[PDB]
């Protein structure tokens, strides 16, 4: 199939994923609920990621998100999964092949960019999560490469 019958489904997969963070990103006021963030920061910077570091960083989220018993976050952690399988049929059509990301090869290497300072929160893992989505959209009108 055409990248761009790749990138339409993936355009509103993104769009569709993100809006369940924004869901429950509705309470993240100013130091009023938004407590038990490790520290009031977001190291998860939103960087300029190729198709390759797009899928790891799904992966490696999901090593964090398995300890975030929450309902909220643990079912997007599924719908993670519909961006990646069209990530990987896109780099096909511009005739890139990229490894498939196993989950569990960066935990410790992306671990200490948390340092687990109580990432027990939604607000948390969402407010990292929100924009790495996010993160795979735009960056397909920009450079995805493998």
Known sequence: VPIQKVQDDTKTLIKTIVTRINDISHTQSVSSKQKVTGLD???GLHPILTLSKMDQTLAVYQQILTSMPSRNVIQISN????????????????????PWASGLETLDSLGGVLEASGYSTEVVALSRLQGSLQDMLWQLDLSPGC
Do not use: G, M
Not at 79 to 98: G, I, P, Q
């Open 41 to 43: 920061f977001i190291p």
């Open 79 to 98: 719908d993670l999964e519909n961006l990646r399988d069209l990530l990987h049929v896109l780099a096909f059509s511009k005739s890139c092949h990229l």
